[PDB]
Amino acid sequence: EFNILLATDSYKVTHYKQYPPNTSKVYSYFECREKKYEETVFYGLQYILNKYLKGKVVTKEKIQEAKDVYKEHFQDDVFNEKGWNYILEKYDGHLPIEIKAVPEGFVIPRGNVLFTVENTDPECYWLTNWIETILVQSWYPITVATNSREQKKILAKYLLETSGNLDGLEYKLHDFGYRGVSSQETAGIGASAHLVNFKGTDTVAGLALIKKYYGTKDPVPGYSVPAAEHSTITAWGKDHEKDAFEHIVTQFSSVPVSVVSDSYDIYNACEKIWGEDLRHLIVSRSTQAPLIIRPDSGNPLDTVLKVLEILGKKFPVTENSKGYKLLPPYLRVIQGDGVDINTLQEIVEGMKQKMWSIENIAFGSGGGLLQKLTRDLLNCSFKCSYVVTNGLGINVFKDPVADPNKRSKKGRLSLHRTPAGNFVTLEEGKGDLEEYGQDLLHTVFKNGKVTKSYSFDEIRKNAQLNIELE
Amino acid sequence: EFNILLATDSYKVTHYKQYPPNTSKVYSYFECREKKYEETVFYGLQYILNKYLKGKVVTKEKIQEAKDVYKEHFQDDVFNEKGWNYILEKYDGHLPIEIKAVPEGFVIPRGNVLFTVENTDPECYWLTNWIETILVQSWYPITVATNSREQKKILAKYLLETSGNLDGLEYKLHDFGYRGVSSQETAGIGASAHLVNFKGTDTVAGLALIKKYYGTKDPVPGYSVPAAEHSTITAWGKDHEKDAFEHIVTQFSSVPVSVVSDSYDIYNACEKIWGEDLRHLIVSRSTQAPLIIRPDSGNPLDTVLKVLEILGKKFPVTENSKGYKLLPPYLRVIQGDGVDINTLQEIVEGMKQKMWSIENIAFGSGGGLLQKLTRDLLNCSFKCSYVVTNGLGINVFKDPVADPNKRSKKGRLSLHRTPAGNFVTLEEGKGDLEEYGQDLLHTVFKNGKVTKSYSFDEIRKNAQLNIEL
Ligand SMILES: O=C(Nc1ccncc1)[C@H]1C[C@@H]1c1ccccc1
Numbered sequence: 028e029f030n031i032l033l034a035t036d037s038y039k040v041t042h043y044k045q046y047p048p049n050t051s052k053v054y055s056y057f058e059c060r061e062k063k064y065e066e067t068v069f070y071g072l073q074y075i076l077n078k079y080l081k082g083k084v085v086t087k088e089k090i091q092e093a094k095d096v097y098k099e100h101f102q103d104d105v106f107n108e109k110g111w112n113y114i115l116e117k118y119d120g121h122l123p124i125e126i127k128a129v130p131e132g133f134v135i136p137r138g139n140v141l142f143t144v145e146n147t148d149p150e151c152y153w154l155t156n157w158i159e160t161i162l163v164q165s166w167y168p169i170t171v172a173t174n175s176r177e178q179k180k181i182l183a184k185y186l187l188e189t190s191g192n193l194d195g196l197e198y199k200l201h202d203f204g205y206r207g208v209s210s211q212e213t214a215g216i217g218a219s220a221h222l223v224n225f226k227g228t229d230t231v232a233g234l235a236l237i238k239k240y241y242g243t244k245d246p247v248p249g250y251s252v253p254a255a256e257h258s259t260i261t262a263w264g265k266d267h268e269k270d271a272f273e274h275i276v277t278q279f280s281s282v283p284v285s286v287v288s289d290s291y292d293i294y295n296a297c298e299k300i301w302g303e304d305l306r307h308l309i310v311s312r313s314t315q316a317p318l319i320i321r322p323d324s325g326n327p328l329d330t331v332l333k334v335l336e337i338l339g340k341k342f343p344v345t346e347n348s349k350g351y352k353l354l355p356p357y358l359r360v361i362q363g364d365g366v367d368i369n370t371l372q373e374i375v376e377g378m379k380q381k382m383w384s385i386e387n388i389a390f391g392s393g394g395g396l397l398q399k400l401t402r403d404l405l406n407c408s409f410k411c412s413y414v415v416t417n418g419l420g421i422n423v424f425k426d427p428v429a430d431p432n433k434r435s436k437k438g439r440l441s442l443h444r445t446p447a448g449n450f451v452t453l454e455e456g457k458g459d460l461e462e463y464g465q466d467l468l469h470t471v472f473k474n475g476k477v478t479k480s481y482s483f484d485e486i487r488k489n490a491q492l493n494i495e496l497e
Numbered sequence: 498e499f500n501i502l503l504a505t506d507s508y509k510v511t512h513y514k515q516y517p518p519n520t521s522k523v524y525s526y527f528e529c530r531e532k533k534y535e536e537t538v539f540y541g542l543q544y545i546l547n548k549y550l551k552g553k554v555v556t557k558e559k560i561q562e563a564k565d566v567y568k569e570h571f572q573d574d575v576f577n578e579k580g581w582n583y584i585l586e587k588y589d590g591h592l593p594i595e596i597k598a599v600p601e602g603f604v605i606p607r608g609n610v611l612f613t614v615e616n617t618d619p620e621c622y623w624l625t626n627w628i629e630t631i632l633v634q635s636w637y638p639i640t641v642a643t644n645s646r647e648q649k650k651i652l653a654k655y656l657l658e659t660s661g662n663l664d665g666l667e668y669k670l671h672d673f674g675y676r677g678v679s680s681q682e683t684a685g686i687g688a689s690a691h692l693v694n695f696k697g698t699d700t701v702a703g704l705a706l707i708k709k710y711y712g713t714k715d716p717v718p719g720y721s722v723p724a725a726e727h728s729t730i731t732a733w734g735k736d737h738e739k740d741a742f743e744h745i746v747t748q749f750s751s752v753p754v755s756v757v758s759d760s761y762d763i764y765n766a767c768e769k770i771w772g773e774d775l776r777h778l779i780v781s782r783s784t785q786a787p788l789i790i791r792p793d794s795g796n797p798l799d800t801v802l803k804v805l806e807i808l809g810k811k812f813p814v815t816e817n818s819k820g821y822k823l824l825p826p827y828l829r830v831i832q833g834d835g836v837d838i839n840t841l842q843e844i845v846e847g848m849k850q851k852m853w854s855i856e857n858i859a860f861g862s863g864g865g866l867l868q869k870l871t872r873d874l875l876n877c878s879f880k881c882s883y884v885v886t887n888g889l890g891i892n893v894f895k896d897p898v899a900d901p902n903k904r905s906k907k908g909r910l911s912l913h914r915t916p917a918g919n920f921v922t923l924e925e926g927k928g929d930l931e932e933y934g935q936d937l938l939h940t941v942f943k944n945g946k947v948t949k950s951y952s953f954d955e956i957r958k959n960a961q962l963n964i965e966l
């Protein structure tokens with residue numbers, strides 16, 4: 028049982044006593060603060076609204092539980108029982124909050140308002156920032172989606188250059204991160220964010236999240252193929268690696284199959300086992316059912332290049348129309364060790380310099396894709412910009428003397444199109460002057476109800492690369 | 498509804514067809530592989546066993562659900578419906594698996610077996626590695642607990658050096674990480690791991706997890722105090738920072754209170770607002786209720802030193818018996834911006850060089866404590882080391898030519914004390930020779946039941962520092 032009264036930073040329990048007396052409104056906003064990663068994919072708020080914020084989220088039992096915990100946690104009675112009881116009694120436990128947000132999947136430059144939050148009842152001035160903690164966790168799906176999309180840009184650039192098209196782009200970066208994230212819940216959220224950009228995942232948790240909170244026309248948003256792990260090779264005994272390989276490709280003779288080949292000696296496996304002993308089982312395969320050789324150790328670039336060099340001398344290689352080398356269609360490689368945005372770039376550039384088409388390769392990324400990310404990467408941050416006290420609206424902000432990068436925006440905010448068609452965030456309520464047309468934010472949550480939402484299909488469309496659009 | 502059939506890496510769905518025919522046993526183990534972090538705190542498995550693995554985890558509906566998902570996900574029928582149905586029918590959906598583990602809270606050098614997993618029914622040879630993905634997520638609480646403990650070592654060293662004792666050590670690193678982690682579930686897990694070493698947290702989710710899965714004799718495992726955020730200062734208006742400060746310290750006059758002081762100018766706030774205008778509200782406070790000034794921007798070391806310098810000239814400073822400067826007991830500082838294990842070390846060393854006692858300072862850490870960690874830090878890894886095929890046991894392993902650091906252990910494993918009192922992992926079933934005393938791994942899970950559990954108090958005792966001991 029999730030309890031929103033226990034889902035905030037402890038200190039926020041004490042904030043209702045700290046605001047100016049007679050404050051009726053606290054209005055706050057989220058941005059990926061300006062400080063690469065020049066643009067961000069807005070994704071993941073819909074999950075939070077539906078799972079945690081909507082409907083009757085306050086009960087008598089939840090109030091009592093919070094009261095009991097905080098009494099011990101603070102060694103003192105500081106919890107706002109009356110304020111929560113008010114929400115329970117007046118609104119049947121629905122949060123009197125309004126949230127406006129940019130559409131999910133939208134690609135927005137850094138330093139723009141992405142969503143805003145304010146209380147709709149003056150008694151609940153304290154509620155706006157109570158829910159900061161839970162809303163700020165949107166940093167994670169935003170950051171995974173953004174970083175995944177940046178890798179898609181790299182792949183698109185090199186695939187286009189070496190092959191002349193973008194065929195298969197959406198399968199070129201595969202999610203291997205299930206074991207390498209910090210929890211089951213994180214796995215689902217992160218995998219779903221990667222699927223905004225790609226269709227390949229082994230993190231099964233992502234599928235159910237998308238189906239429940241977003242939805243797609245297709246039965247599932249992501250796909251995989253049969254593949255070995257070291258245990259299914261090594262279990263055969265060291266002297267029987269060939270027997271393992273033969274068994275596995277024969278079991279999966281009519282679908283693609285990935286086979287980890289570095290259990291003992293990746294180079295021997297490629298040149299002698301695949302390239303000689305079992306070559307007859309590989310050259311007979313369909314182009315719809317390639318063997319995908321998987322190295323998993325060594326310097327990622329050096330190993331990929333050597334694997335390709337080996338395979339190129341054992342199998343028929345062609346030269347595509349762009350002048351790049353191409354393995355036969357029944358044979359491909361996947362590099363799934365040590366892959367992050369930096370090493371991805373290094374590998375594709377190294378392949379290009381050695382005249383290997385990016386058609387030859389796919390990438391798997393685990394920790395690099397879903398775990399090795401923090402809220403600091405995009406400076407995802409939630410701040411109060413406007414309050415009303417004694418009936419007077421005041422534009423408020425922070426501006427620390429030793430770090431201008433932490434300055435926050437002032438007043439009521441709105442998001443607009445500029446005359447050149449770019450985004451601009453207007454501060455100090457200046458959107459009301461109507462010199463920049465209509466506010467692009469939409470009300471997505473109001474008084475316990477989700478008022479606007481997006482399918483996963485629409486999110487994917489919003490998050491497309493320009494090069495995909497053209 | 499969590500469905501264990503959907504809680505694995507997709508490729509594992511296909512592995513039942515890949516093992517050698519006539520394989521009746523797959524035995525696997527977890528270690529923090531040797532490659533700084535020389536010893537690791539084993540913590541978090543009990544959470545996973547109880548939340549996800551125990552009891553009736555297979556149902557007819559869960560089997561059909563997985564069958565339906567995998568058909569679309571693979572565009573093919575590759576799912577082992579028969580194998581899962583066997584578990585449902587024979588074991589009432591309880592997993593025929595045995596897991597043996599070192600006690601939670603134990604501090605073990607890198608490269609040792611921490612837990613092992615094996616099937617208890619020959620039909621379920623494939624199940625051992627099905628659950629690799631979910632068990633390997635134990636890397637997270639192990640790594641948080643370990644990294645938190647390493648920071649405790651740094652704090653203990655410098656606190657002892659500058660003050661002569663370790664009073665308050667368990668409150669010196671406070672968890673600020675709730676907003677900076679990737680999910681609600683991660684928040685609870687990570688916060689609980691930090692609480693193995695410390696008692697201060699604002700990540701409330703950690704308390705409920707500990708209460709549910711571990712338990713403590715005291716009502717709660719972690720504590721906090723009232724504190725401001727920028728919004729409760731800035732809401733007063735730029736020209737009214739002093740009014741906000743005054744209101745807040747007066748509201749919380751008899752308890753400790755942390756007040757963020759850098760909204761506009763941290764140095765002005767310390768020297769003029771706290772140090773002059775409101776000084777009378779500070780020097781009147783109890784030792785049990787200090788003002789805790791909180792900078793939150795600028796170079797962490799430079800800002801801490803400048804804050805201390807300012808306060809030292811506006812408030813009476815003493816020199817303790819070790820020769821280090823000490824603020825009055827009603828005034829302390831907390832640095833809660835940009836703190837990780839590296840910058841923590843930098844700050845305490847810088848303070849020491851400038852003759853400031855570590856008694857003066859506490860640290861808050863958020864992303865650095867709970868998020869900026871990966872499975873690679875301690876090389877947490879799960880590997881098959883033993884199989885039985887055609888009734889014969891075989892010791893198995895990987896040993897990639899280009900990376901000896903990825904070599905895995907061979908055969909049946911056990912963990913023992915050495916004659917000098919250290920730890921050793923015995924391979925190839927050599928523990929059976931009985932030359933190294935009892936195996937330190939205990940059965941914690943067998944056939945759907947959690948067979949051995951630890952309280953959070955026991956875990957804390959096991960994870961103590963030597964200096965504490
Ligand atoms: O290579 C694989 N899958 C694959 C390959 C090519 N296209 C799609 C999926 C799986 C063996 C890789 C894997 C998957 C999940 C975790 C760890 C390793």
Ligand SMILES: O=C(Nc1ccncc1)[C@H]1C[C@@H]1c1ccccc1
Pocket residue numbers: 036037038671672673674697699721722723724725726755789791831833859861
């Ligand atoms: O300083 C604080 N708490 C504190 C201070 C000293 N001892 C214990 C807790 C809270 C204001 C810090 C905070 C807490 C949670 C998230 C972000 C920032």
